[PDB]
């Protein structure tokens, strides 16, 4: 693979040119490997398992290798009831997340965090179907400067910052994380969604958040990822609520709908939308990504899609010279899986997929946190 800039210049293409050396290396190495390959990871790979069969990650049970990327969530870390102490269940979750992230970094994996941020008035729900009309219509407005919950929101960012700056690997370096907040904002299922705020409000929230974390709180081990769901067909629509090249490192999208038993038509839609992201990332010197995907199987309800991984997902990720740094599956949980373990339908198909040269799991990860010389 080849890039149009030298490693030593990477800082000039980053939201935070003062990032730690390992965070700069992560940006460079993701951009470089995206020319012809991509990392595959999974949300909660070290703590959430099909049928709660704990031990190795399900991807390692299946393939023999851990995933190349671990997804985690700030949800429990920012809960109103997380008091930081050992008896507290939310703190126990925070500590387990921290241990899994440090384990991932020590093994060389990439770490991505999303944030299922419970709305600020009562702190109980992030899904709009579960909150009141008043909460839906006013949650995001209330956290902007001038909003009645703005100081509350600053305190949540301060907790994200203190957690993030606490992540020290076994090598003594801070763990770089990709932070992907306010995702899927083109849908209506979260309170930061498009029916509940204007374009200007969403962009103001994004810019305030990046600047407060990077500048006020001096968080230097973070890359920033922007990701709608799949509700666009053009560059202009993808960019509708984009906060600007000074505020985004990773251009992502989430896509389950085009894979949900939609045939080759859905595969084509998924590839076309990812190509838009990939084209914009090439033009703006960003990293592109399919930040969430999967086809969820619950054997008492539905079955696997024949050739899903090899013929559907892989084709969408590669056809027409798509360039992405990584993709991530959602978690496996109880009787529902989106990556198989041995003996389940889609296991062979998954093996064929992960054997493709483009796919990078833990065993074939580059040294992502070392910058090569010029």
XYZ file of C-alpha atoms in Angstrom:
374
model
C 0.000 0.000 0.000
C 0.991 3.614 -0.669
C -0.140 7.026 0.594
C 0.324 10.540 -0.771
C 1.916 11.823 2.472
C 4.861 10.783 4.645
C 4.357 9.269 8.109
C 6.075 12.241 9.777
C 3.384 14.563 8.351
C 0.437 12.579 9.775
C -0.221 15.136 12.529
C -1.119 17.731 9.892
C -4.115 15.582 8.835
C -5.477 14.891 12.336
C -8.160 16.612 14.404
C -5.588 16.750 17.203
C -2.082 17.500 15.890
C -0.916 17.296 19.545
C -2.037 13.671 19.876
C 0.205 11.074 21.534
C 2.718 9.308 19.312
C 0.722 6.054 19.399
C -2.485 7.908 18.403
C -0.687 9.461 15.412
C 0.635 6.015 14.476
C -2.877 4.549 14.712
C -4.211 7.159 12.275
C -1.347 6.622 9.823
C -1.504 2.842 9.969
C -5.296 2.648 9.546
C -5.114 4.958 6.552
C -2.244 2.926 5.061
C -3.809 -0.497 5.506
C -7.155 0.757 4.137
C -5.578 0.999 0.646
C -6.032 -2.740 0.242
C -7.150 -4.386 3.506
C -9.347 -3.872 6.560
C -9.456 -4.890 10.219
C -12.452 -6.912 11.412
C -13.612 -6.513 14.982
C -16.602 -7.014 17.269
C -18.358 -5.087 20.030
C -17.666 -6.514 23.518
C -15.685 -9.384 22.028
C -14.048 -10.214 25.410
C -17.194 -9.939 27.605
C -20.291 -10.879 25.517
C -20.643 -14.364 24.080
C -23.194 -16.508 22.308
C -25.099 -18.469 24.988
C -22.846 -16.740 27.561
C -20.151 -19.357 26.902
C -17.371 -17.217 28.364
C -13.668 -17.752 27.838
C -12.094 -16.936 24.482
C -13.823 -14.340 22.294
C -16.360 -15.947 19.975
C -14.249 -14.905 16.983
C -11.313 -16.833 18.491
C -13.537 -19.848 19.252
C -14.519 -19.770 15.569
C -11.291 -18.817 13.741
C -8.467 -19.452 16.220
C -7.619 -15.720 16.202
C -8.978 -12.892 18.319
C -10.621 -10.040 16.380
C -8.355 -7.199 15.257
C -10.559 -4.575 16.899
C -12.599 -4.315 20.094
C -15.727 -2.158 20.426
C -16.717 -0.781 23.839
C -19.323 1.705 25.097
C -19.139 4.717 27.421
C -22.784 4.004 28.502
C -22.076 2.524 31.944
C -19.011 4.745 32.482
C -21.200 7.869 32.311
C -24.273 6.572 34.141
C -25.710 8.941 36.749
C -25.502 6.138 39.292
C -21.843 5.261 38.683
C -20.198 6.467 41.908
C -16.789 5.024 41.135
C -16.612 2.561 44.020
C -16.188 -1.242 44.196
C -19.719 -2.072 45.415
C -21.274 -0.197 42.520
C -22.409 -2.287 39.553
C -21.827 0.470 37.003
C -18.272 0.963 38.264
C -17.767 -2.809 38.080
C -18.779 -2.612 34.393
C -16.427 0.356 33.890
C -13.560 -1.634 35.383
C -14.279 -4.667 33.224
C -14.339 -2.403 30.131
C -11.033 -0.881 31.209
C -9.459 -4.344 31.663
C -10.711 -5.517 28.231
C -9.441 -2.333 26.520
C -5.991 -2.657 28.112
C -5.911 -6.358 27.145
C -6.825 -5.394 23.583
C -4.140 -2.694 23.398
C -1.465 -5.001 24.870
C -2.285 -7.484 22.067
C -2.177 -4.692 19.462
C -5.894 -4.486 18.713
C -7.638 -1.224 17.834
C -10.214 0.099 20.359
C -13.387 1.964 19.345
C -15.916 3.477 21.801
C -19.494 4.447 21.050
C -21.698 6.145 23.670
C -25.268 5.077 24.402
C -25.732 8.257 26.446
C -28.899 8.222 28.531
C -30.816 11.441 28.099
C -29.947 14.143 30.641
C -33.255 15.017 32.326
C -33.706 11.680 34.088
C -30.666 9.694 32.975
C -32.546 6.445 32.347
C -33.110 6.026 28.569
C -31.323 6.666 25.312
C -33.980 5.118 23.023
C -36.601 7.721 22.143
C -39.420 5.117 22.287
C -38.778 4.781 26.037
C -38.673 8.459 27.018
C -41.305 11.190 27.228
C -42.184 13.554 24.404
C -40.640 16.425 26.363
C -37.370 14.530 26.803
C -37.181 13.524 23.118
C -37.782 17.081 21.945
C -35.457 18.852 24.379
C -32.615 16.529 25.449
C -30.062 17.616 22.825
C -31.004 21.285 22.984
C -30.558 21.129 26.773
C -26.882 20.071 26.569
C -25.754 22.849 24.222
C -24.249 26.022 25.689
C -27.156 27.913 27.235
C -29.086 24.683 27.845
C -30.269 23.790 31.322
C -28.242 20.549 31.203
C -24.999 21.993 29.791
C -23.012 21.772 33.039
C -24.328 18.211 33.471
C -23.033 17.383 29.997
C -19.624 18.944 30.700
C -19.371 16.684 33.765
C -20.057 13.629 31.592
C -17.296 14.693 29.178
C -14.998 15.173 32.169
C -15.713 11.559 33.178
C -14.997 10.361 29.625
C -11.732 12.333 29.700
C -10.585 11.035 33.090
C -11.363 7.457 32.065
C -9.642 7.859 28.707
C -6.506 9.468 30.199
C -6.321 6.591 32.715
C -5.810 3.945 29.994
C -2.112 3.016 30.291
C -0.916 -0.125 28.480
C 1.632 -2.587 29.774
C 4.209 -0.702 27.681
C 3.553 2.522 29.616
C 1.853 4.396 26.769
C -1.686 5.774 26.744
C -4.135 3.597 24.797
C -5.430 5.441 21.688
C -9.168 5.169 21.342
C -11.538 6.005 18.512
C -14.492 7.910 19.965
C -17.718 7.651 17.887
C -20.398 9.760 19.642
C -23.978 10.614 18.650
C -24.063 7.897 16.020
C -26.953 6.949 13.738
C -28.240 10.518 14.033
C -30.106 10.189 10.699
C -32.547 7.803 12.365
C -35.153 8.695 14.991
C -34.363 6.042 17.607
C -31.887 8.159 19.635
C -32.580 11.606 21.111
C -29.722 13.111 19.075
C -31.636 12.048 15.939
C -32.639 14.323 13.121
C -36.303 14.832 14.092
C -35.272 16.247 17.462
C -32.644 18.849 16.545
C -31.621 21.106 13.699
C -28.526 20.591 11.547
C -26.934 23.583 13.255
C -27.652 22.158 16.722
C -26.126 18.763 15.894
C -23.029 20.404 14.417
C -22.736 22.765 17.398
C -22.901 19.778 19.747
C -20.182 17.959 17.799
C -17.841 20.961 17.648
C -18.335 21.799 21.317
C -17.660 18.173 22.249
C -14.459 17.793 20.241
C -13.051 21.105 21.461
C -13.948 20.475 25.096
C -12.284 17.043 25.088
C -9.215 18.002 23.027
C -8.568 21.526 24.302
C -10.235 22.117 27.689
C -9.601 18.586 29.012
C -6.348 17.936 27.053
C -7.374 14.478 25.849
C -4.542 13.538 23.515
C -5.247 9.822 22.962
C -8.482 10.120 20.932
C -9.427 9.973 17.260
C -12.960 11.123 16.377
C -15.403 9.097 14.250
C -18.577 10.420 12.577
C -21.167 7.798 11.615
C -24.753 8.050 10.380
C -26.764 4.913 9.762
C -27.532 4.069 6.109
C -30.117 6.744 5.221
C -28.239 8.490 2.430
C -27.614 7.966 -1.274
C -25.291 10.876 -2.059
C -22.264 12.784 -0.791
C -24.454 15.812 -0.052
C -26.775 13.726 2.108
C -23.893 12.026 3.928
C -22.447 15.488 4.660
C -25.753 17.102 5.740
C -24.852 17.120 9.471
C -21.076 16.707 9.080
C -19.310 19.102 11.470
C -16.259 19.793 9.347
C -12.878 18.374 8.416
C -11.325 20.021 11.507
C -13.578 17.863 13.709
C -13.594 14.342 12.203
C -10.807 11.756 11.729
C -12.859 8.701 10.700
C -15.785 8.888 8.277
C -18.032 5.964 9.104
C -21.500 4.580 8.580
C -23.568 1.864 10.230
C -25.449 -0.560 7.999
C -27.657 -3.452 9.040
C -30.699 -2.649 6.911
C -29.169 -3.282 3.494
C -28.043 -6.718 4.715
C -31.336 -7.763 6.351
C -32.506 -10.364 3.818
C -32.478 -7.754 1.031
C -30.747 -9.838 -1.631
C -28.203 -8.576 -4.120
C -30.116 -5.290 -4.393
C -29.331 -4.620 -0.733
C -25.714 -5.643 -1.235
C -25.484 -3.118 -4.092
C -27.000 -0.339 -1.958
C -24.525 -1.140 0.826
C -21.575 -0.986 -1.565
C -22.768 2.268 -3.159
C -23.171 3.959 0.207
C -19.790 2.721 1.471
C -18.183 3.956 -1.775
C -19.503 7.439 -1.026
C -17.858 7.309 2.408
C -14.679 5.846 0.919
C -14.534 8.521 -1.810
C -14.961 11.336 0.710
C -12.290 9.850 2.980
C -9.883 9.731 0.027
C -10.645 13.347 -0.887
C -10.442 14.723 2.687
C -7.562 12.526 3.954
C -9.783 10.690 6.464
C -10.116 7.003 7.345
C -13.315 5.387 6.063
C -15.122 2.616 7.953
C -18.262 0.515 8.144
C -18.450 1.163 11.887
C -21.315 -1.306 12.645
C -22.721 -4.146 10.585
C -24.055 -7.669 10.849
C -27.001 -9.933 10.179
C -28.460 -11.109 13.488
C -29.433 -14.798 13.685
C -31.726 -16.238 16.365
C -32.242 -19.881 15.408
C -35.722 -20.127 17.008
C -36.815 -17.186 14.812
C -34.642 -16.875 11.680
C -31.818 -18.717 9.944
C -28.502 -17.725 8.413
C -28.373 -16.123 4.953
C -26.447 -18.500 2.642
C -23.104 -16.980 1.707
C -23.786 -13.863 3.786
C -20.189 -13.178 4.781
C -18.375 -14.229 1.632
C -20.856 -13.158 -1.071
C -22.750 -10.268 0.548
C -20.724 -8.469 3.219
C -17.319 -9.093 1.627
C -18.543 -7.867 -1.751
C -19.989 -4.690 -0.262
C -16.682 -4.045 1.568
C -14.476 -4.467 -1.501
C -16.272 -4.033 -4.846
C -15.481 -0.923 -6.877
C -12.254 -0.170 -4.976
C -13.815 0.704 -1.600
C -11.054 1.618 0.898
C -11.912 1.228 4.605
C -9.690 0.893 7.649
C -12.004 -1.356 9.629
C -15.418 -2.859 10.063
C -17.077 -4.030 13.267
C -19.834 -6.498 14.082
C -22.229 -5.849 16.929
C -22.031 -8.165 19.938
C -23.201 -11.755 20.264
C -25.586 -12.161 23.179
C -27.655 -15.044 24.576
C -29.343 -16.834 21.631
C -28.601 -14.117 19.056
C -25.373 -13.991 17.110
C -23.917 -12.046 14.260
C -20.632 -13.924 14.181
C -20.805 -17.731 14.406
C -19.059 -20.227 16.639
C -18.315 -23.774 15.519
C -21.323 -25.885 14.651
C -23.603 -22.930 13.975
C -25.055 -22.130 10.602
C -22.733 -19.663 8.754
C -19.560 -20.999 10.386
C -17.951 -22.190 7.153
C -19.025 -19.063 5.308
C -17.415 -16.956 8.041
C -14.200 -18.964 7.768
C -14.083 -18.369 4.070
C -14.628 -14.654 4.649
C -11.888 -14.270 7.289
C -9.481 -16.222 5.086
C -9.689 -13.559 2.360
C -6.377 -11.682 2.071
C -8.109 -8.329 2.707
C -9.316 -9.405 6.179
C -7.094 -8.593 9.192
C -7.748 -10.319 12.559
C -5.480 -10.194 15.628
C -3.034 -12.764 14.276
C -2.234 -10.688 11.192
C -2.397 -7.206 12.694
C 0.424 -4.815 11.750
C 2.133 -2.907 14.545
C -0.543 -0.224 14.543
C 1.020 1.950 17.224
C 4.483 2.389 15.680
C 5.030 5.029 13.040
C 7.372 3.865 10.273
C 10.225 6.117 9.164
C 9.969 8.266 6.054
